[PDB]
Amino acid sequence: MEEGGRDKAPVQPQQSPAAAPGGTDEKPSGKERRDAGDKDKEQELSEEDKQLQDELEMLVERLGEKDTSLYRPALEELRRQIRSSTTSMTSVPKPLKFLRPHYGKLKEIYENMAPGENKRFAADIISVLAMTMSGERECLKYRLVGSQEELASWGHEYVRHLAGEVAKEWQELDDAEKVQREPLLTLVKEIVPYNMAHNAEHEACDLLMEIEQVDMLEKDIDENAYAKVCLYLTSCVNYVPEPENSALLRCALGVFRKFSRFPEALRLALMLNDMELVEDIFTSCKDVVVQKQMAFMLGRHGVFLELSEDVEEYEDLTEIMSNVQLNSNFLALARELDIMEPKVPDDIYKTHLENNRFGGSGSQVDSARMNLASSFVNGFVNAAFGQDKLLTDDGNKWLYKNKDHGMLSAAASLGMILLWDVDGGLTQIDKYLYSSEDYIKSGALLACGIVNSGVRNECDPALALLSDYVLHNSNTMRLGSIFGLGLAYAGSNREDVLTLLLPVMGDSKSSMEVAGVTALACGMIAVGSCNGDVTSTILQTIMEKSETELKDTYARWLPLGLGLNHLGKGEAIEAILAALEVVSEPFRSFANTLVDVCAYAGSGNVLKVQQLLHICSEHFDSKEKEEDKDKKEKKDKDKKEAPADMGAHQGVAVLGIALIAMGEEIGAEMALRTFGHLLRYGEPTLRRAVPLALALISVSNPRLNILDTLSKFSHDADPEVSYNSIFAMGMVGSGTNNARLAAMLRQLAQYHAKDPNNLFMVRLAQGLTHLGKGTLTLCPYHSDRQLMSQVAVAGLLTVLVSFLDVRNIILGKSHYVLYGLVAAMQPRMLVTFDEELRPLPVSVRVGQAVDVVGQAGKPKTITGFQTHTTPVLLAHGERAELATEEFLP
Amino acid sequence: IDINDVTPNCRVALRNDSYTLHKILPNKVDPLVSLMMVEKVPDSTYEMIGGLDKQIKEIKEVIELPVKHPELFEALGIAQPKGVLLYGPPGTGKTLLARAVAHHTDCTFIRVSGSELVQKFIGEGARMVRELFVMAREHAPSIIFMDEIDSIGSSRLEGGSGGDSEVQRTMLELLNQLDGFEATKNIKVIMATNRIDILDSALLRPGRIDRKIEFPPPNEEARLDILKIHSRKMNLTRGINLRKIAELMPGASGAEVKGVCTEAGMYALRERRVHVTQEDFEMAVAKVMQK
Amino acid sequence: ASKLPLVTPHTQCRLKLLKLERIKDYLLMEEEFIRNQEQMKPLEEKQEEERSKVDDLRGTPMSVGTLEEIIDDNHAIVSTSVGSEHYVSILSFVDKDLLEPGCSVLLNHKVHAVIGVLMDDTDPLVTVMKVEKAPQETYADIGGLDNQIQEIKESVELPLTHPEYYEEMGIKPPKGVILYGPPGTGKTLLAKAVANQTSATFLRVVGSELIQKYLGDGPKLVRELFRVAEEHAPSIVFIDEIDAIGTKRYDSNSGGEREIQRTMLELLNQLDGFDSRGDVKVIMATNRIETLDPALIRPGRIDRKIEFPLPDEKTKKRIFQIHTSRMTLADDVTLDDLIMAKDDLSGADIKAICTEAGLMALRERRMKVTNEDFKKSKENVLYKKQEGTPEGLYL
Amino acid sequence: KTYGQSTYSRQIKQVEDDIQQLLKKINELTGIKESDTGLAPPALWDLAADKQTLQSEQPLQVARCTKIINADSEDPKYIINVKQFAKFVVDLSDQVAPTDIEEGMRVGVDRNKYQIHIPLPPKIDPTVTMMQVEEKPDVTYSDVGGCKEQIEKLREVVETPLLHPERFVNLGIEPPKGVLLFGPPGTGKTLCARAVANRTDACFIRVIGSELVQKYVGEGARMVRELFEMARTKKACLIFFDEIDAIGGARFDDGAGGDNEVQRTMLELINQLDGFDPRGNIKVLMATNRPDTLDPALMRPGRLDRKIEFSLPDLEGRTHIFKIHARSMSVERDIRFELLARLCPNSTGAEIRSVCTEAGMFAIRARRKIATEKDFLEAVNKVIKSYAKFSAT
Numbered sequence A: 001m002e003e004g005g006r007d008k009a010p011v012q013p014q015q016s017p018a019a020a021p022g023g024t025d026e027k028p029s030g031k032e033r034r035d036a037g038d039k040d041k042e043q044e045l046s047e048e049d050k051q052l053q054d055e056l057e058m059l060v061e062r063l064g065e066k067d068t069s070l071y072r073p074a075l076e077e078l079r080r081q082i083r084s085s086t087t088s089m090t091s092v093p094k095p096l097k098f099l100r101p102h103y104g105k106l107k108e109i110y111e112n113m114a115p116g117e118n119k120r121f122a123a124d125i126i127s128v129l130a131m132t133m134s135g136e137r138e139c140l141k142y143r144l145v146g147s148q149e150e151l152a153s154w155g156h157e158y159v160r161h162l163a164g165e166v167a168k169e170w171q172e173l174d175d176a177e178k179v180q181r182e183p184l185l186t187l188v189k190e191i192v193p194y195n196m197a198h199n200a201e202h203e204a205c206d207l208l209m210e211i212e213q214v215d216m217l218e219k220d221i222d223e224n225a226y227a228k229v230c231l232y233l234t235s236c237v238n239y240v241p242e243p244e245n246s247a248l249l250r251c252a253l254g255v256f257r258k259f260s261r262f263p264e265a266l267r268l269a270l271m272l273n274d275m276e277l278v279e280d281i282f283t284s285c286k287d288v289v290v291q292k293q294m295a296f297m298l299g300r301h302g303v304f305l306e307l308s309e310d311v312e313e314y315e316d317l318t319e320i321m322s323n324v325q326l327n328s329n330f331l332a333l334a335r336e337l338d339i340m341e342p343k344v345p346d347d348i349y350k351t352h353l354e355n356n357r358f359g360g361s362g363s364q365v366d367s368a369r370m371n372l373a374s375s376f377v378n379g380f381v382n383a384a385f386g387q388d389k390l391l392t393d394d395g396n397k398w399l400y401k402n403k404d405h406g407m408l409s410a411a412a413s414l415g416m417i418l419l420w421d422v423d424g425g426l427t428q429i430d431k432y433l434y435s436s437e438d439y440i441k442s443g444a445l446l447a448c449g450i451v452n453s454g455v456r457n458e459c460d461p462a463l464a465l466l467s468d469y470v471l472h473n474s475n476t477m478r479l480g481s482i483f484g485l486g487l488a489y490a491g492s493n494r495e496d497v498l499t500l501l502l503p504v505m506g507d508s509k510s511s512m513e514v515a516g517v518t519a520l521a522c523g524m525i526a527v528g529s530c531n532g533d534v535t536s537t538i539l540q541t542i543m544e545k546s547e548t549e550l551k552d553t554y555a556r557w558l559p560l561g562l563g564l565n566h567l568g569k570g571e572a573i574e575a576i577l578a579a580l581e582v583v584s585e586p587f588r589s590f591a592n593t594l595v596d597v598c599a600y601a602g603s604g605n606v607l608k609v610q611q612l613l614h615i616c617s618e619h620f621d622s623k624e625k626e627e628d629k630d631k632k633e634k635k636d637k638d639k640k641e642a643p644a645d646m647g648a649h650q651g652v653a654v655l656g657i658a659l660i661a662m663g664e665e666i667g668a669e670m671a672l673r674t675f676g677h678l679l680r681y682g683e684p685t686l687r688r689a690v691p692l693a694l695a696l697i698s699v700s701n702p703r704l705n706i707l708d709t710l711s712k713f714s715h716d717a718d719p720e721v722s723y724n725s726i727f728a729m730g731m732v733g734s735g736t737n738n739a740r741l742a743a744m745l746r747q748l749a750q751y752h753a754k755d756p757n758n759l760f761m762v763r764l765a766q767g768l769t770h771l772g773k774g775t776l777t778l779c780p781y782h783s784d785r786q787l788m789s790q791v792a793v794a795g796l797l798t799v800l801v802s803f804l805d806v807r808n809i810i811l812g813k814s815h816y817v818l819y820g821l822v823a824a825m826q827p828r829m830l831v832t833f834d835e836e837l838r839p840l841p842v843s844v845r846v847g848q849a850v851d852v853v854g855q856a857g858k859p860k861t862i863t864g865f866q867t868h869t870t871p872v873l874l875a876h877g878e879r880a881e882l883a884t885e886e887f888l889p
Numbered sequence B: 001i002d003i004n005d006v007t008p009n010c011r012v013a014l015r016n017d018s019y020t021l022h023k024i025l026p027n028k029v030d031p032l033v034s035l036m037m038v039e040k041v042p043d044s045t046y047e048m049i050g051g052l053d054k055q056i057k058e059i060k061e062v063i064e065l066p067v068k069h070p071e072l073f074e075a076l077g078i079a080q081p082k083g084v085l086l087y088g089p090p091g092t093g094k095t096l097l098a099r100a101v102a103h104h105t106d107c108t109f110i111r112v113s114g115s116e117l118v119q120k121f122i123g124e125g126a127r128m129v130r131e132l133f134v135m136a137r138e139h140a141p142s143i144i145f146m147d148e149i150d151s152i153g154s155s156r157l158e159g160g161s162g163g164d165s166e167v168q169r170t171m172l173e174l175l176n177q178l179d180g181f182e183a184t185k186n187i188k189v190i191m192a193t194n195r196i197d198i199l200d201s202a203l204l205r206p207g208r209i210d211r212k213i214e215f216p217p218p219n220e221e222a223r224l225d226i227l228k229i230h231s232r233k234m235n236l237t238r239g240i241n242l243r244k245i246a247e248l249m250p251g252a253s254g255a256e257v258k259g260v261c262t263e264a265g266m267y268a269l270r271e272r273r274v275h276v277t278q279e280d281f282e283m284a285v286a287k288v289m290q291k
Numbered sequence C: 001a002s003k004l005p006l007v008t009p010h011t012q013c014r015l016k017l018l019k020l021e022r023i024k025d026y027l028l029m030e031e032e033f034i035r036n037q038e039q040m041k042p043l044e045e046k047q048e049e050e051r052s053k054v055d056d057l058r059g060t061p062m063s064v065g066t067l068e069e070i071i072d073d074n075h076a077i078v079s080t081s082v083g084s085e086h087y088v089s090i091l092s093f094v095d096k097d098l099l100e101p102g103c104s105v106l107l108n109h110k111v112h113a114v115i116g117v118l119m120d121d122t123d124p125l126v127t128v129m130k131v132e133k134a135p136q137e138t139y140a141d142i143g144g145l146d147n148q149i150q151e152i153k154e155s156v157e158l159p160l161t162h163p164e165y166y167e168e169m170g171i172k173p174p175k176g177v178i179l180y181g182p183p184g185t186g187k188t189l190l191a192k193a194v195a196n197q198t199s200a201t202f203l204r205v206v207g208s209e210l211i212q213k214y215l216g217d218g219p220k221l222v223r224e225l226f227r228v229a230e231e232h233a234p235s236i237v238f239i240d241e242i243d244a245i246g247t248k249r250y251d252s253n254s255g256g257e258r259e260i261q262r263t264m265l266e267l268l269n270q271l272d273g274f275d276s277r278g279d280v281k282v283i284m285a286t287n288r289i290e291t292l293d294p295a296l297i298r299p300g301r302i303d304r305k306i307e308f309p310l311p312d313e314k315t316k317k318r319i320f321q322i323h324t325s326r327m328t329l330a331d332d333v334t335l336d337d338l339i340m341a342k343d344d345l346s347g348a349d350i351k352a353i354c355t356e357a358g359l360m361a362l363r364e365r366r367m368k369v370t371n372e373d374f375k376k377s378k379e380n381v382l383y384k385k386q387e388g389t390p391e392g393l394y395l
Numbered sequence D: 001k002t003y004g005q006s007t008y009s010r011q012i013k014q015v016e017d018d019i020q021q022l023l024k025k026i027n028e029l030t031g032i033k034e035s036d037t038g039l040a041p042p043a044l045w046d047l048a049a050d051k052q053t054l055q056s057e058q059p060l061q062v063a064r065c066t067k068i069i070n071a072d073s074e075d076p077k078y079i080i081n082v083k084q085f086a087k088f089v090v091d092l093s094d095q096v097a098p099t100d101i102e103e104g105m106r107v108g109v110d111r112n113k114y115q116i117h118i119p120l121p122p123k124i125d126p127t128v129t130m131m132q133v134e135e136k137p138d139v140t141y142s143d144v145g146g147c148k149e150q151i152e153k154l155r156e157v158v159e160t161p162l163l164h165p166e167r168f169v170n171l172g173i174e175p176p177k178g179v180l181l182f183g184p185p186g187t188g189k190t191l192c193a194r195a196v197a198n199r200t201d202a203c204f205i206r207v208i209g210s211e212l213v214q215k216y217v218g219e220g221a222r223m224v225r226e227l228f229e230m231a232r233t234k235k236a237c238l239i240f241f242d243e244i245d246a247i248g249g250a251r252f253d254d255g256a257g258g259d260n261e262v263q264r265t266m267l268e269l270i271n272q273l274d275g276f277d278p279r280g281n282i283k284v285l286m287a288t289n290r291p292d293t294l295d296p297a298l299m300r301p302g303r304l305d306r307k308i309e310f311s312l313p314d315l316e317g318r319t320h321i322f323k324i325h326a327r328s329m330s331v332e333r334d335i336r337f338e339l340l341a342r343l344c345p346n347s348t349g350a351e352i353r354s355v356c357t358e359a360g361m362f363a364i365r366a367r368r369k370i371a372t373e374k375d376f377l378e379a380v381n382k383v384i385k386s387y388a389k390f391s392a393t
């Protein structure tokens, strides 16, 4: 140990504690200069920060920690020229003995010294062993002070300026890879008053250079998903002026400003339309902004532009936002004729050419339920102009023969076969509107609704044909006749269809399934804040539910609609008007939970999630209260999908352990629909864990405890190699058993993975993760599922086509001004970069370089090359445009 | 039957239809303990063997002094050696010096044949170096004598990528049990070998082995001593004048002296006598020297 | 097992603090439920019926075998005890994650379908060329090389113990370190001293072993050496005396003298020729520099070129301090004058001095140390180091 | 007492350290079986102890595998052997038609009646399936810049016929299915190989150059046979060879008792490359550092048609390699790279990558988050001095 001797540090820096007690008095030269002769040396040796151990970092420290109390207050000459070391043992020689924030108490005294080290000690202080003290003193001292001691003792007045100059210095010094420290220091400082210092940081970035502004922005999108509720209400509005005022990118913001649609207010939800209106730099870049306000998340302002032919290119902007013909049908046609096979003559259900030779002979099943399921299968995969005229003649003969439910569900085949072809599809459906069968005519009305789903045509052919049937008769044909208006006009808000469908909802009619399907329409015609529909729904509920103690059909559809009125924006202010008045009868704790913790989509508030299991865990209920925990289980499907694999693997960790192996009834019957609502693309974890509790049929109860799990397990779209599991599951549930209650549900549940050829989008996360309706429509598809007693009598009609919210899953086009290009793209996996060196590969999946304008499936991030700038959105999701001139070959 | 009595390598009976353990048959023997390396009371020469006097002093100062003086090594702070390597032409005090050293150091002498009869059951060598050392740890303060065969058994780990024939692993097993933790204790080893430059003594140098002692071809005095030793267990005439036989042939190794005695017994047997005469030794020297 | 991939930023970044705070809420909600699960249904039926059912579902004679190929996700072709191969079906109580072509699986006695997989015995190659534990103690026994320790500290230890600095500015750590110097200075020694402060396993190979008399086992042994080291851990491979093989290629004359060029080209290709292996750190010790292949010398395979000079007197005091520490010393013997006029020794010779200076005292049965013990040890070790070099003409 | 990394860098340790053992507490509180001599977790074999194994036992028999040798006419009547049991004459079952039942592939046979049930893929030894790459490294062509003419030559050889088989049909030419790469070491041959395997739209098969040199006689010819048969089975694969001097370029006879077996392997390669029904739509890439001790049969075109060379860049390509290698860094936007390329006259891409790593080494040696501008300038000047010394010795 040669530490000592040759270095000055044990001799002269330790002789230096001899001039504050013995040189303050009687030595005006010795007041400072006796100390200053080694003190300027210490300052120079401390600004040069290369070693962990400096000759004054640990050597004088041993007397230094008591020198800050016995010597520095005994200096008694504290001036501007003493700010060389006595401004610096906190942002320079930190002490050895660390008792939590002991330096938090030391830097109360050193806070007045901290403007001494403002400029020469600005550079190397957000590095080395000084930024811990700087950030932690700022955060903890502002936590202690806040704003109650605003004018009291400078704990808000100079602390704001110090944090502002530190945040300025963070990019003044280096613009390093710790740019995200700048939100962090503005985070713990000012948790609640956050807006002032964050707007100070925003004005600093207004002074900053305009190319770094991307990365902190996605850091903001990193924190605008799960921080805290009141922190969403300020962070999502603190996103707003940054790419709008500082930068002028003006299209990468509006794709990521629907996060602030629901939590803040409807005013900010429409100020996207407002500042898209008031911004008028040429035409193309704003056309990219309204290309997703078309119909990709929510149309909304798709009838809000025209005033007196004032907006530039109004007629083209309206043709885009309406999703109508050449911006949809043409494209799908332009793929399906030119990249795919337009035949698809039910060969997915005709690929089992090698199964009746397996195990003896065949021709044993004679049940009249396979016909409907095969009809739905062949009418399911023939989407996008695969019109099978004179092929549904088996369905035509089954219209007049049997299966009135099946006769209704077969007439929707032509409607679900010309999806989005509003102009051509009506001419193909017309031939059925004059049928002598109410089932065929009702199915043709439902087909007219299905064709218009997600397309706003100026001629309103859905409203104009379905209107006359809404109040047609008191029986079943009374029931289904509303449903087209329930489907084609569910993403908008117009009063005319609302007062159209209101009188059946408000006449106290005692046919409960009619009331339920009208509630399933009218509670989600507008997913907004319509209080009149809320009052109509709740009054109509308290109009027949109270004087009974019977089945879940009472809660099947009407409280589902009452939840759907404010679902997706339920920040627990819907509780006090909805749930608090409906605490009348106890048999529908299903419904009470359904309207109580209805709430909203994937967000934070994990205390609500643990409320959903902590109180009502199992409770050993004797088949009387488990439906409350059934709903409270399907509420756990939400709060996990939109956070983008945050709690999704946590979700499958919980209910793949806690409930599937230990549930008495719920985990074995109802808790398996979550695999269809949480995820839809399928990976070998969950798509293989689902048959692990499904290959066992569990015939102790009725066998449809497993058929619903089969439908939810094969509910995943996007065609795959799952044919082996599908076919083996078909053969273990084949004509050996061929159960009639699952005879149609078997064939439905086997071959619907390759549902459409490529339009497999049911994810409900557009761009990156924003929701975009759909879940409101997806909820009756798997929430109405209660095993049997609805596929035959009442309940199948709601689960027919309520999931039809596909939104053009094609991931390749150009749309070069007026579609003047083909382009060469590069599909590659999810965004693996969050925070490293500033440019990076976005993902690692090579790219599989394909010129052909094809789909990407769900998990992808498709970038461009060939020097085409991809100038329009900077978010790589395929919509349109892709302009030119990178001035580079 | 009980689970705990089932050990590795015990013969058991399985039933005909479903293989269930019927009865544990008794084992026959442990193969190494059947052929066990014979412990002898060491019959030394009483150190009269002239010519190897330099080898006597070297083996004294090299291997005896750690056994007799732990205090000297502890006071000087020198780590006590473990092994001693011997090399030279065959017959020139291979096993005789080890026997004389073992008897004069008050320790028993163990000789390990172990060439290839052990390795017939391929991995028996992996237990051969185990149990032997166990007896050399449990019997007394003693030495272990081991021949060239280990170098014949392995050179290095070129058979690690070649196969090891489960013999180099044996060497590897010996390696850890040669390292172990002894610090003399009560077990020491002496290596006698020929052709030293095939094995892997560079890794064996730190700690495990130590200084090596050469051996020359024998002089006349050591030749007469070898002849007097090998003429012990033989019914011979008095007045044989073994010095005359020692000067009778000019120069040879020590291995031919044994053949001299056996074919001298042959020529004595052709005389139909229990005697072994001088002329038998003269014709013995002539016939053996001829070949 | 795969709790979540929740580490994006690799920095302070409170979202990581939030993500770990978000991950605990699902964990505490699980332990709350399972504690409430056990008090209501304590029946461990998984070990009661299911474990008893499979034990009778599996045949009581289990016939072992060898896997050969996995045909699909439900059927795999296996071998049998002697010659026959089947097309049995893999079941679903067998783990398929460690199911590999080569490990022994076990079949039933009638259908021969594979039930499971027996535990694979570890390779014997690990047991032989491992350096075992610390062959020498820590850095207190080595002398003064200072910056030589420093470069290996920041290239082998610093990426291992603290991998929280290299990724901060996103620079991959350097791969190869080469140690060169005069013959006996610190070469490998230092390499044994670094193989006690390391965390992962250490594999030592020697270049004298890296020849084979059979044409073909040369590059196969090099390939199998790195394959074992890669699959285990973030291990470190030390090729001692690598300069024996990869010296030059200009001869190209027939025999094994060109086979050495062929057995080094595989090492050159496996070091960095295609899809460079993660978390394997190489270290190479040579005696010479100029007779080396320049394709090894180029970066991408070795970067840290380390020079080992001979210390003249300063650390030689500390080398003598270390070597004479665990022994006696008298007042008459002092080591300063023995090295005062001499400035041409090495650290192997100093240990050769100190081991032999204790050998005169034991062989004469004398006192502990004398001064003349050190005097004649210096003269004889000089005879051992410099004996017969024909230099009367000073070049 | 201690020292902290960054702000609250110590309570993060506790909050992720307690939950990691609390997961183990969760696992033991549930009760988890550990190492059941080869088995599955109880939430993972829950369908194994179910009717899934009963459907996996009753219909599917053993169907023991066999090899076919000869087929008869009209009636099928296949001659067959099992592996070592016996040889038989058998028929196919009614479950499969007699079309994909040609000679020389393994077929499954029922153990009772001895009838053919289902064909299997042919036997490929595992030492040549491992060298099939099965994954693609991500090396964009933008990462191999500075070598524009060589890059576009390799592009117009390989990528154009495999993506545009329209130009060559109407122009009536044939592409050069063999291209050799050569130059100084560390110049980008490996990078060009990875760049080819990036966007290949095909199957890529890599070969270790010393893999074929084996102990027994004649087995390397078997590797070349199985390799080219695997190439012929799929459509449009790409063979990559590296370090071709190990396979063999010399033809020595000066007392020819040295290498002869590797000459036989080279000869079987040389034959399978060209002549008597050639391979088809496959391409061959080769790379070596000494293309002067090679076989004149190899250098003959029809097997090797381009000799693409590499060299010490220029002055501009050093700046390009700087801009593509040091872009993944935290440096202030003030570094000039053309001066740094001026200061290093003769260097490879590996040396530039080593400059980029030593920049981070300077950034880590001092306690800095980044490599600052003057820090980068001092770092590059010190490593230029260091590389002058390193090229000296």
Ligand SMILES: Nc1ncnc2c1ncn2[C@@H]1O[C@H](COP(=O)(O)OP(=O)(O)OP(=O)(O)O)[C@@H](O)[C@H]1O
Pocket (backbone or CB within 6 Å): C272, C295, C299, C300, D143, D144, D145, D146, D147, D184, D185, D186, D187, D188, D189, D190, D191, D192, D289, D321, D348, D349, D350, D351, D353
């Ligand atoms: N033009 C280049 N652009 C970018 N990096 C390059 C370039 N040329 C070489 N490099 C770098 O050089 C490193 C090492 O060279 P490389 O692996 O290509 O060797 P090589 O030319 O195949 O030589 P050898 O096979 O003789 O070792 C690569 O990892 C790569 O990053």
Ligand SMILES: Nc1ncnc2c1ncn2[C@@H]1O[C@H](COP(=O)(O)OP(=O)(O)O)[C@@H](O)[C@H]1O
Pocket (backbone or CB within 6 Å): C141, C142, C143, C144, C183, C184, C185, C186, C187, C188, C189, C190, C319, C322, C346, C347, C348, C349, C351
């Ligand atoms: N600085 C030192 N401190 C302690 N021992 C040393 C030192 N330098 C050399 N030695 C000794 O010199 C010997 C030679 O080391 P090394 O050069 O790695 O082996 P080789 O000469 O066989 O390559 C080692 O056994 C070591 O004990």
